[PDB]
C-alpha cells in the first residue's frame, strides 16, 4: 500500500486506568508536508506546539502535535511522521549517510511504584512526567535533551546500521535490511536499565518493528518509525544526506 505516513495519539491515564499503552497507529492520508494531522484538535490547546519544519526537507517530516501546557486529563496531542515520492532510484555504487532527527510519546503509567519523575524543572515542560499522559519529545528542554538520528547507508548490500542520539547520549542503535525503497529491521535500546526517579529510563524496551521508506527520487531523504515491544514507546524519524 505504501502508507504516506502514520500517525499516533499520547496515551492518557487515569486513576481508573494508571498504565495506559501505545495504540492505534493511525495511517496519515495527505502528502501534504505543509499539513499537520490533528492539526483542528490543537486549536483548544493552552499552549499549541507544533514542531517546527526543516526548510532543508523536501520529501519527509516527522514532528509532533501537542498541548505545551497540558494538565489533568486534556488530550495532550499526536505523534506522526509522513513523506512522500517513494523513491524510484537509489544511489548504486555510494555508501550514504541520512542525518536528521527523531521525536517520540511514550506510555502513560501513573503508577507511583514505576518510578517516573514528578518534577524535574532543568528537563522538561510538563510535571508528573510520563505519568498523567505520555512523555513527548516536545516536552524537553532544549538546553538538556536534542534528539538527532543518522543512519549508514550501503545501497550494495541493501543495509542500513545507524544511531538515535539524544545530546551526546546513544539511546538506540538500529540495524535494517533494505527492500526495493522500503525498509524494515530492529531498533535496540543502548540503555536497557529502567532505573527510577531523576535517572529513569524512558527508552529501555526492543523493538521489531522498526519501518521505513526512501524518498525523493534519487533517495535523497528517509523517514520511518518503530514501536516497542512491550508498547512503551512509539518513535518516529527522518533524516536527509549527505
Given at each position: 500500500?505504501?502508507?504516506?505516513?502514520?500517525?499516533?495519539?499520547?496515551?492518557?491515564?487515569?486513576?481508573?486506568n494508571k498504565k495506559v499503552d501505545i495504540s492505534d497507529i493511525e495511517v496519515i492520508t495527505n502528502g501534504n508536508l505543509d499539513d499537520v494531522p490533528y492539526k483542528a484538535n490543537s486549536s483548544?490547546?493552552?499552549?499549541?506546539?507544533?514542531?517546527?519544519?526543516?526548510?532543508?526537507?523536501?520529501?519527509?517530516?516527522?514532528?509532533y502535535v501537542?498541548?505545551?501546557?497540558?494538565s489533568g486529563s486534556n488530550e495532550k496531542g499526536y505523534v506522526y511522521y509522513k513523506g512522500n515520492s517513494p523513491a524510484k532510484e537509489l544511489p548504486v555504487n555510494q555508501l550514504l549517510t541520512y542525518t536528521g532527527s527523531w521525536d517520540f510519546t511514550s506510555n502513560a503509567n501513573l503508577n507511583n511504584e514505576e518510578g517516573r519523575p514528578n518534577y524535574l524543572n532543568d528537563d522538561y515542560y510538563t510535571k508528573f512526567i510520563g505519568k498523567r499522559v505520555g512523555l513527548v519529545s516536545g516536552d524537553a528542554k532544549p538546553a538538556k535533551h536534542k534528539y538527532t538520528s543518522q543512519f549508514e547507508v550501503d545501497f550494495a548490500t541493501k543495509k542500513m546500521t545507524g544511531?538515535?542520539?539524544?545530546?551526546?547520549?546513544?539511546?538506540?542503535?538500529?540495524?535494517?535490511?533494505?527492500?526495493?525503497?522500503?525498509?524494515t529491521g530492529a531498533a535496540t535500546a543502548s540503555d536497557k536499565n529502567k532505573?527510577?526517579?531523576?535517572?529513569?529510563?524512558?527508552?529501555?524496551?526492543?523493538?521489531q518493528s522498526?519501518?521505513?521508506?526512501?524518498?525523493?527520487?534519487?533517495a535523497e531523504e528517509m523517514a520511518g518509525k518503530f514501536v516497542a515491544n512491550d508498547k512503551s514507546l512509539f518513535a518516529v524519524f527522518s533524516a536527509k544526506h549527505n
Open positions: 500500500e505504501p502508507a504516506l505516513g502514520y500517525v499516533v495519539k499520547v496515551p492518557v491515564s487515569s486513576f481508573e483548544k490547546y493552552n499552549y499549541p506546539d507544533i514542531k517546527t519544519k526543516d526548510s532543508s526537507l523536501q520529501y519527509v517530516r516527522s514532528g501537542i498541548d505545551g501546557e497540558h544511531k538515535l542520539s539524544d545530546k551526546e547520549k546513544t539511546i538506540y542503535t538500529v540495524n535494517a535490511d533494505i527492500r526495493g525503497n522500503r525498509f532505573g527510577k526517579g531523576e535517572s529513569y529510563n524512558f527508552f529501555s524496551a526492543d523493538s522498526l519501518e521505513g521508506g526512501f524518498y525523493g527520487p534519487k
